[PDB]
Amino acid sequence: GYWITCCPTCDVDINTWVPFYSTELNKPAMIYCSHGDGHWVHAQCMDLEERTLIHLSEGSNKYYCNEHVQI
Amino acid sequence: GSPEFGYWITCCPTCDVDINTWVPFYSTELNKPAMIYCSHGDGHWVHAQCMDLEERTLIHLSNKYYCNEHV
């Protein structure tokens, strides 16, 4: 599930990916979108600043990707 | 079903599920593992994979169920 195209503007590619967040090493950080059945997106593709990513990972707040945030 | 606190809990002492490594196993697994409810008292949700249940059994059970730790 890591090397999927997470959204129409997805920039994560297995032939070009490099660490961006301080917590990444050989794999891209991902966050779970709670829309409908749900789906995973690459945090970087959502333009999430690192601290926002981390706060989301430490809380129980749901997350909705830039495509689904609006009802 | 839907467990109250997620699909990423360590369901049993042997719990093998890690959100960072979990991949689809059942012919149905999208972004979360398949769970079943052990009715032993309080009752807890457990991962189907951790109970080494074969898909036909899983699908079939979906009366009452009791995990490997309780029968």
């Binding site: 917590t23 991902m30 779970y32 | 960072n20």
Partner: peptide, 9 residues
């Protein structure tokens, strides 16, 4: 929210 690779090295 649940995440991946957000663990602190």
């Amino acid at each position: 929210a649940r995440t991946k690779q957000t663990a602190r090295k």
